[PDB]
Design a protein around this ligand. Structure first.
Ligand code: CLA
Ligand code: CLA
Ligand code: CLA
Ligand code: CLA
Ligand code: CLA
Ligand code: CLA
Ligand code: CLA
Ligand code: CLA
Ligand SMILES: CC1=CCCC(C)(C)[C@H]1/C=C/C(C)=C/C=C/C(C)=C/C=C/C=C(C)/C=C/C=C(C)/C=C/C1=C(C)CCCC1(C)C
Ligand SMILES: CCCCCCCCCCCCO[C@H]1O[C@H](CO)[C@@H](O[C@H]2O[C@H](CO)[C@@H](O)[C@H](O)[C@H]2O)[C@H](O)[C@H]1O
Ligand SMILES: CC1=C(C/C=C(\C)CCC[C@H](C)CCC[C@H](C)CCCC(C)C)C(=O)c2ccccc2C1=O
Ligand code: SF4
Lengths: 732, 138, 33, 161, 51, 162, 107
């Protein structure tokens, strides 16, 4: 058996555990036999190339499947009535009524209705026909092939980079900030000015004419003259019909603010100046570090020099440079945390300030996008903490970090965990007490006895942004404030028009239910942070197991001795925190979907009166919106929601299956497999057939992971089916 | 040496006995002497009656043999038991007691295997021994 | 749908022939000594 | 008023809530004979509902558009009895409770067998301790400043870092 | 012969084309596909099991 | 893989050449019958109510596979069943598809094998390579012009078939 | 089963608020709470809770309020038993409230 060629210990396993553990440790290159650091970095570089190629192939596949089987050319003409098609259906297990019921979108074959929002994004950036969609798919296929060839090439001899090249922090930071962030943003601003804005104004720009069709009538002469404000003159009129010249302006760079009154999305000129400014700022950031020419900053000197002289941080940040450069897991945790924060930021800011034309009226698409990127955010943050725990297990050198900030985290880890526990118990005790209190007093016929705290802090913030609903009369809601007079000539009219109109999701009105659900969200975030931080900081050892770092990041237990040591590793803390992450994104998406459905229905008072107690959530959101989902198929017929009606139940099945690997444990199943081995060995006409690997029960860590996987898949598929089918049944 | 001609305890048979891996990979044997014919519990499930005199028994695992040895030690005061490992080629490897003296009693000539010359809290952190074949013990 | 024969050609291939050969060859690879 | 809310004593939807509750209790009252104990119980429930709505309307509570009282908790004194002053009452009691429990723990260490004191409470000594809690902030602060509340880090067990 | 002979029956009697005029042809073709799958199973078993 | 006669081996080239000669024959005979109208109900659309959901193609008119395409596919299914049975249960005298691990590989014939006319393996390999090259050329001439493959074969043969 | 039995007949227990059967709805929610609380014992293990109890013991040691009886996490068998007991209580109480509210309302 030589499948796990990277592990001799796994390859000598005589049982079925070998295949599973080779599958689960295949990409754990640091644990492989005889792995050196240079080989590790080169394999990581090529794997990153392969993932980039996979992303490009997926995007090219989306573009191609739309150019072939979509209705983009029909959808551009009538964006607010035509249902967008994701891809075609060819399933031979279908009966005829299922073929009939999925034939939508103005085509003659069964199709799925798109929820990804690629129509609005591609239409906003200037694609109009199916031809350029196919050309973009071809370009991304070619780009993916180029990156596959680069991944092969940069592993070939005399091209394999050295460890000094990989650990060049200053050069990589300068090039990735100035070029990968800055010049990419400048080029996207260029694409918006040169292509997207003219196509938004009904004038065709492609590769055949973009060198002869000026983005602005005055050309680049106002840019080279320093009369840049000429590019701000004659913006798009409030009567502008998107994709046509009727009411179109000539400006290419404005900061008008608010939304286009027809598309209910941000002005494209604002997006172009934003990405231009982001490019300029990032190129200015990308000249900061010294690479070859004496000027620039040194990262080691900046880290060592910022030690506060009062001694409250100890030695400050001395040794953090080598600890960060030498540990890929510390870097991975930092990157995953920052990525999770910004995809949460994307999820909040894109529903609140949409940039794609007509996507604010596509309720299913907004729900799917928010839910998707928020679940991605939870996964990324959990991964950040998990790989930080791996950094403490594998890479943390105390002797290189004497009196460091990391060492001082470790020296007051008990205070951190105890105060996290205190705030988690505080939040849970009083939030659950208010919710149960409201339930009990509403059930007894006295809703006037509820404890309803007005969220005056966030309402004050909304008034500071210009919301005149609450009468706070402060900052942008004050017509005499210095901020109001400062911004009155630039952006205040459009922003005030967008924030004080109740037709969008810009700073939606909030009440006691919003207060309670944000404090529940704070409870869940603090508790997940408690589990993850306690796992990371106790990863090296505890009072029950002071030599945990000798046993690695993942192991089942330390035996029944010393009272019992079940789930003591930091991997087990990851495993416990995954449920709480699913709970937190569940609460967030429940709040988002119920509030947005009640506003879209014109029945926001139902949310305002029912969200203060749990029975309102169970009845008016879960039970009430389940009716089109559970009627996707029935004894009277079926319709297009039936697949979600299947998938919903599918989730309710697979979620439950996870429980069996999380409740029942190993020895029972192992003895059953002994009985099955005896049965197969003693049965005639079947003992002629022999297994090559001995059948064994799944290991403890493997069973925890498999139960987690079935649980998580059920969670995701159940909520996705519910949100899409419910939004479609109410609004589509 | 293992005498293959030692008679076995009287057993009616069970489904818990050794599988094909005993005749293919390895098998274990336990011998002991009893002062009388008496009923004992099989480690694979069931009751057997051991004869007066010598008894030879075959098992699939060493732990089953040592469980039987512990059972007859604490219930019948039998300490002369010997456990052997038998391969399909017929080579017999004596296992327990390895030097004739039980492992809980000190015997001369035994050498310490796996002994570490410091406390467990003096083990190395993984960061010293990453990308290096040095042991965590030092 | 232009080239409508392609779904009916490729979906049975991708869904039954590709996984069967992948499972067979992966089985052969992981069980061989 | 605060945050665009209206006082409950002039809110028409607060009156609609009161009227709906009164009619809901009165339609149950209609099915019973006058003088029967269910009729008296229902009339008492009506009286409690009217008194509660009257008391809530004259208290300066703010009502939202739902028709329920909304609490203000930003620190302003005009609603200082809605969160700040009851919370201090809890702060009075809870700081009491822990302190007397802490005192009992310091007593229990001095006994011959502490764990028997832990499971079997010395009731006179515990009653003395629960009497001591009425001046708990000043006593706790003097315990803190004399170095008898906080122990140094070198006398507390910690795991290997 | 025995197993392939009895494999025809359930596919003919219970398949999705059982109420059509080509029920037996579809059932035999499905049985042949199952036979080919089992032959592939035999082939990979013999490849991995014996030297 | 390579030790069993699979991959770039002389056996695999010979087998693909044999299959390519048969493919040239099948395309020519298909073109001859399709030009001459020997396919009964060639434009008949197969109905889902008889043949099930596998007959769905989802084109713009009829939404069913034509009867002619089904007849061509069933003709191929016959020789696929023959292929499977010959691959698993070959004749004792027949050349086998997969070879044993300790087999002797046939020597590569280079640019051109020795000119042995008749039912010799050299002539078989020469027409097999010729048939593979002809299939490549026919495919390229079909996709660079828009001419259908049957019509391309008829034009390259000078309208002999029809 | 999901729609015509579970979804359909639970209308009575979730609209019982403000009526005499509202206690069943409260119990319905409470059983829904406790059963989920049971999974915290069922899915987790002793070592995590023992180390968290170590941190809480450090917190109580900082204020010199550590008890003489050393707090330990519940045993593995006790963890299984507590999770099973709260699971059974939650499920039986949920079915209890749902059945009783439905059959009192419609029968
Ligand atoms: C200017 C030169 C330049 C540029 C452009 C890059 C570019 C890149 N390098 Mg890099 N590199 C450079 C110089 C450069 N390098 C130098 C000089 C060195 C040596 C010191 C290295 C050493 C190096 C290593 C060692 C690695 C890379 C990697 C990467 C890739 C990161 C993955 C990726 O695509 O993220 C794309 C990222 C961006 C486009 C910017 C970040 C985007 C953020 C999240 C904001 C975007 C939000 C926005 C609203 C989304 C809009 C889109 C939405 C509509 C869908 C990327 C292609 C990694 C890789 O994958 O290798 C193949 C890697 O491991 N580089
Ligand atoms: C870009 C993000 C990123 C990257 C590069 C990695 C990379 C890695 N992770 Mg990580 N992880 C991530 C996101 C990421 N993960 C997220 C989001 C989570 C939370 C769900 C985790 C949770 C996680 C755990 C719990 C563990 C890892 C482990 C690993 C290592 C081996 C992976 C393996 O064998 O799987 C191979 C998987 C397959 C072949 C299936 C396909 C590898 C260094 C493991 C390890 O060895 O660390 C010690 C480990 O125990 N990670
Ligand atoms: C009236 C209804 C009500 C009810 C039933 C509860 C119930 C509870 N509260 Mg609570 N609380 C309420 C209203 C209520 N609260 C209000 C209105 C406030 C605002 C002032 C608070 C503020 C509050 C805090 C700040 C804490 C609680 C805690 C608790 C829990 C433990 C009780 C306790 O203190 O242990 C008995 C006391 C001890 C065992 C030791 C004494 C510790 C006390 C709390 C210190 C008080 C003095 C200290 C100097 C003040 C520090 C507060 C500072 C951080 C702002 C319990 C479930 C505690 C908790 O959840 O723990 C995580 C907790 O820390 N509550
Ligand atoms: C609804 C289910 C539920 C509930 C209520 C809890 C509750 C708790 N979990 Mg938890 N957990 C759950 C499911 C649940 N878990 C699941 C499914 C998992 C995945 C395995 C986890 C994983 C998990 C981890 C990994 C951690 C927790 C932690 C916590 C505690 C702090 C969080 C909090 O809000 O404190 C507030 C506490 C509550 C709201 C609990 C309810 C308190 C009750 C209502 C008080 C009244 C009791 C009542 C009077 C008793 C009378 C009964 C008698 C008559 C018989 C708390 C005890 C963390 C912890 O211990 O932090 C200190 C921690 O580290 N849990
Ligand atoms: C990852 C991207 C992706 C995905 C999920 C799909 C999904 C689908 N395609 Mg599609 N396709 C894609 C890219 C993709 N396509 C690209 C780039 C092309 C251009 C060559 C096509 C061309 C295409 C045709 C012509 C047809 C489909 C069809 C289908 C459907 C049936 C599956 C099938 O027969 O595949 C067949 C797909 C191929 C033969 C092309 C391979 C797909 C790309 C190139 C590979 C991507 C792999 C990925 C990056 C790595 C995965 C690793 C691991 C997870 C396995 C299904 C909805 C069929 C359909 O319409 O049924 C209704 C059909 O007839 N596809
Ligand atoms: C994406 C993959 C995929 C595809 C393309 C199909 C396609 C089909 N399934 Mg299906 N199926 C799938 C996945 C898939 N299934 C999965 C995952 C399951 C498990 C839940 C099932 C369970 C299932 C059942 C239980 C049944 C079908 C049936 C059918 C057929 C529909 C009825 C009909 O007209 O056929 C008429 C039937 C035929 C024309 C027989 C086709 C025989 C093929 C062509 C022989 C090929 C053998 C093999 C692939 C050769 C290569 C071997 C190699 C892989 C080792 C159709 C061919 C029905 C059927 O008729 O099957 C008998 C049926 O009863 N399926
Ligand atoms: C003598 C009582 C006492 C005191 C003063 C403290 C003090 C403290 N505890 Mg602790 N605790 C206690 C009992 C006590 N504990 C008991 C009995 C339990 C088991 C339920 C806990 C469980 C516990 C947890 C799980 C946590 C704390 C935490 C804390 C700290 C913050 C305050 C807090 O969260 O309170 C909240 C207190 C509770 C939730 C439990 C209180 C239970 C009752 C109400 C107190 C016992 C009163 C006692 C019976 C009176 C008898 C005396 C009489 C004979 C005179 C602080 C060091 C937290 C921490 O680490 O913060 C830094 C934290 O996470 N404690
Ligand atoms: C299979 C053998 C075969 C046969 C019998 C024919 C027969 C014929 N071909 Mg032809 N041809 C063949 C193979 C064959 N070709 C191949 C392999 C190609 C390359 C793809 C061509 C390309 C070809 C062209 C381009 C033309 C013919 C033409 C002709 C016709 C008159 C010229 C002539 O005598 O051909 C002499 C032999 C050859 C040209 C090649 C041998 C004649 C009926 C002509 C005609 O009238 O067709 C419409 C014509 O213009 N052939
Ligand atoms: C555990 C593990 C061990 C070691 C490795 C590891 C990776 C380090 C770690 C994992 C760690 C975790 C994951 C670390 C990652 C952690 C979390 C996610 C950091 C969140 C930071 C939020 C910043 C401070 C800002 C908000 C904006 C502020 C400045 C604004 C104010 C203002 C701005 C200007 C604008 C307007 C708003 C107002 C308020 C007016
Ligand atoms: C001491 C140094 C002072 C500053 C020096 C650098 C100033 C900026 C230099 C810009 C680059 C050179 O600019 C030179 O080529 C440009 C492109 O053909 C010309 O620009 C012209 O053509 C462009 C392309 O059609 C049009 O969009 C412009 O509206 C038009 O003015 C400039 O009129 C010319 O001066
Ligand atoms: C939460 C949890 C614990 C922690 C439970 C603690 C250790 C015991 C809690 C008992 C409390 C103290 C008694 C009842 C709580 C009352 C509501 C308030 C306490 C009253 C005090 C005066 C005692 C485990 O020990 C455990 C063990 C094995 C698997 C899973 C778990 C597990 O999930
Ligand atoms: S029950 Fe399982 S996880 Fe717990 S100590 Fe025993 S073997 Fe380890």
């Amino acid at each position: 058996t030589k499948f796990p060629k990277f592990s001799q210990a796994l390859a000598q396993d005589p049982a079925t555990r070998r295949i599973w553990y080779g599958l689960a440790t295949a990409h754990d290159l640091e644990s492989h036999d005889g792995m050196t650091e240079e080989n590790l970095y080169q394999k990581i570089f090529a794997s990153h190339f392969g993932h980039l190629a996979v992303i490009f192939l997926w995007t090219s596949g989306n573009l191609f499947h739309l150019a072939w089987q979509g209705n983009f050319e029909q959808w551009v003409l009538n964006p607010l009535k035509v249902k967008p098609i994701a891809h075609a259906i060819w399933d031979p297990h279908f009966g005829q009524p299922a073929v009939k019921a999925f034939t939508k979108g103005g085509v003659s074959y069964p199709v799925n209705i798109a929820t990804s929002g690629v129509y609005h994004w591609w239409y906003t950036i200037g694609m109009r026909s199916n031809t350029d969609l196919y050309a973009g798919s071809l370009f991304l296929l070619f780009l993916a092939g180029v990156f596959l060839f680069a991944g092969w090439l940069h592993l070939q001899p005399k091209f394999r980079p050295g460890l000094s090249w990989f650990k060049n922090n200053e050069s990589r930071l300068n090039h990735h900030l100035s070029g990968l962030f800055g010049f990419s943003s400048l080029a996207w601003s260029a694409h918006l000015i040169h292509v997207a804005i003219p196509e938004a104004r009904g004038q065709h720009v492609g590769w055949d004419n973009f060198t002869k069709v000026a983005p602005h009538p005055a050309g680049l002469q106002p840019f080279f003259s320093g009369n840049w404000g000429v590019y701000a003159a004659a913006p798009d009129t409030t009567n502008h019909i998107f994709g046509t010249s009727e009411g179109a302006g000539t400006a290419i760079l404005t900061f008008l603010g608010g939304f286009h009154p027809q598309t209910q999305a941000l002005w494209l000129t604002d997006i172009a100046h934003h990405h231009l400014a982001i490019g300029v700022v990032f190129i200015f950031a990308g000249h900061m570090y010294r690479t070859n020419w004496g000027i620039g900053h040194s990262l080691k000197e900046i880290l060592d020099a910022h030690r506060p002289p009062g001694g409250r941080l100890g030695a400050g940040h001395k040794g953090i440079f080598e600890t960060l450069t030498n540990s890929l897991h510390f870097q991975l945790g930092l990157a995953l945390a920052s990525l999770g924060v910004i995809t949460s930021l994307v999820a909040q800011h894109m529903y609140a300030l949409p940039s794609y034309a007509f996507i604010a009226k596509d309720y299913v698409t907004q729900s799917a996008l928010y839910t998707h990127h928020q679940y991605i955010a939870g996964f990324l943050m959990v991964g950040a903490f998990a790989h930080g725990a791996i950094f403490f297990v594998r890479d943390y050198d105390p002797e290189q970090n004497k009196n460091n900030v990391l060492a001082r985290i470790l020296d007051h880890k008990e205070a951190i965990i105890s105060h996290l526990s205190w705030v988690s118990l505080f939040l849970g005790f009083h939030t659950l007490g208010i919710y149960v209190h409201n339930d009990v007093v509403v059930a007894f016929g006295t809703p006037e006895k509820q404890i309803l705290v007005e969220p005056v802090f966030a309402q004050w913030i909304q008034a500071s942004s210009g919301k005149a609903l609450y009468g706070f009369d402060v900052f942008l809601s004050s017509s005499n404030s210095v901020a109001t007079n400062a911004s009155s000539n630039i952006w205040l009219p459009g922003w005030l028009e967008a924030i004080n109109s109740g037709k969008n999701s810009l700073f939606l009105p909030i009440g006691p239910g919003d207060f309670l659900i944000h404090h529940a969200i704070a409870l869940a975030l603090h508790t997940t942070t408690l589990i993850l931080v306690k796992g990371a900081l106790d990863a090296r050892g505890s009072k029950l197991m002071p030599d945990k770092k000798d046993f690695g990041y993942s192991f089942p237990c330390d035996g029944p001795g010393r009272g019992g040591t079940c789930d003591i590793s930091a991997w087990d803390a990851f495993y416990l925190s995954m449920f709480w992450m699913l709970n937190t994104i569940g609460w967030v998406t429940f709040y988002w979907h119920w509030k947005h459905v009640t506003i879209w229905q014109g029945n926001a008072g139902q949310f305002n009166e029912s969200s203060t107690y749990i029975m309102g959530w169970l009845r008016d959101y879960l039970w009430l919106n389940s009716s089109p989902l559970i009627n996707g198929y029935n004894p009277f017929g079926m319709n297009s929601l039936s697949v979600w009606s299947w998938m919903f139940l599918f989730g309710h099945l697979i979620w439950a299956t996870g429980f069996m690997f999380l409740i029942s444990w190993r020895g029972y199943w192992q003895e059953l497999i002994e009985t099955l081995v005896w049965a197969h060995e003693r049965t005639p006409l079947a003992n002629l057939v022999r297994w090559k690997d001995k059948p064994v029960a799944l290991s403890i860590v493997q069973a925890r992971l498999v139960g987690l996987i079935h649980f998580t898949a059920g969670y995701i598929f159940t909520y996705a089916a519910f949100v899409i089918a419910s939004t479609t049944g109410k609004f589509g | 040496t293992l005498n293959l001609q030692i008679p076995s305890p009287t057993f009616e048979g069970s489904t818990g006995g050794w599988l094909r891996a005993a005749e293919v990979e390895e098998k274990y044997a336990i011998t002991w002497t009893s002062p009388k014919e008496q009923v004992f519990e099989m480690p694979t499930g069931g009751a057997a009656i051991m004869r007066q005199g010598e008894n030879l028994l075959y098992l699939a695992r060493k732990e089953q043999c040592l469980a039987l040895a512990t059972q007859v030690k604490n219930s019948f005061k039998i300490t002369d038991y010997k456990v052997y490992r038998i391969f399909p080629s017929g080579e017999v490897q004596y296992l327990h007691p390895k030097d004739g003296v039980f492992p809980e009693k000190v015997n001369a000539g035994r050498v310490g295997v796996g002994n570490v010359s410091h406390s467990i809290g003096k083990n190395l952190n993984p960061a010293q021994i990453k990308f290096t074949s040095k042991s965590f013990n030092g | 749908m232009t080239a409508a024969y392609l779904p009916s050609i490729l979906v049975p291939i991708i869904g039954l022939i590709f996984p069967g050969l992948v499972m067979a060859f992966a089985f052969i690879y992981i069980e061989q000594d | 008023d605060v945050a665009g809310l209206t006082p409950c004593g002039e809110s028409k939807e607060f009156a609609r809530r009161l009227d709906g509750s009164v009619k809901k209790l009165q339609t149950r009252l209609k099915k019973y004979e006058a003088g029967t104990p269910p009729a008296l119980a229902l009339q008492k429930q009506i009286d409690k509902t009217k008194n509660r709505f009257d008391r809530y309307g004259k208290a300066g509570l703010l009502c939202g558009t739902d028709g329920l009282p909304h609490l203000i908790a930003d620190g302003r004194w005009s609603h200082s009895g809605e969160f700040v002053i009851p919370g201090l009452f809890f702060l009075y009691v809870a700081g009491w409770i822990g302190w007397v429990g802490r005192s009992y723990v310091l007593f229990a260490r001095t006994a011959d067998k502490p764990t028997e004191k832990e499971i079997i409470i010395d009731v006179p000594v515990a009653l003395s301790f629960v009497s001591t809690g009425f001046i708990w902030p000043f006593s706790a602060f003097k315990e803190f400043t004399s170095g008898n509340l906080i122990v140094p880090a070198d006398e507390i067990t910690v795991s290997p870092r | 012969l025995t197993h392939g002979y009895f494999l025809v029956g359930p596919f003919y009697k219970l398949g999705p084309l059982r109420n059509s005029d080509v029920a037996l042809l579809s059932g035999f073709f499905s049985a042949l596909g199952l036979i080919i799958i089992l032959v592939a199973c035999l082939t990979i078993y013999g490849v991995v099991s014996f030297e | 893989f390579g030790g069993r006669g699979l991959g770039v081996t002389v056996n695999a080239e010979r087998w693909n050449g044999r299959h390519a000669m048969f493919g040239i024959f099948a395309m020519v005979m298909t073109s001859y019958m399709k030009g001459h109208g020997l396919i009964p109900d060639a434009d008949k659309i197969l109905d889902v109510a008889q043949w099930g959901s596998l007959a769905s193609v989802w084109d713009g008119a009829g939404n069913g596979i034509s009867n002619e395409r089904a007849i061509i596919l069933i003709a191929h299914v016959h020789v696929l069943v023959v292929s499977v049975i010959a691959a698993v249960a070959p004749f004792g005298f027949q050349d086998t598809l997969v070879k044993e691990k300790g087999y002797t590989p046939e020597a590569p014939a280079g640019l051109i094998p020795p000119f042995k006319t008749g039912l010799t393996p050299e002539a078989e390999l020469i027409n097999g390579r010729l048939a593979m090259l002809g299939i490549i050329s026919i495919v390229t001439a079909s996709v660079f012009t828009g001419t259908p493959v049957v019509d391309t074969i008829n034009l390259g043969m000078g309208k002999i078939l029809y | 089963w999901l729609r015509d039995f579970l979804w359909a007949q639970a209308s009575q227990v979730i609209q019982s608020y403000g009526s005499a059967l509202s206690a069943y709805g409260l119990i319905f929610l409470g059983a829904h709470f406790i059963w989920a609380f049971s999974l915290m014992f069922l899915f987790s293990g002793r070592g995590y809770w023992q180390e968290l109890i170590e941190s809480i013991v450090w917190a109580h040691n900082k204020l010199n309020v550590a008890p003489a009886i050393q707090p330990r996490a519940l045993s593995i068998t006790q963890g299984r038993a507590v999770g099973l007991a709260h699971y059974l209580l939650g499920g039986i109480g949920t079915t209890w409230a749902f059945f009783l509210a439905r059959i009192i309302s419609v029968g």
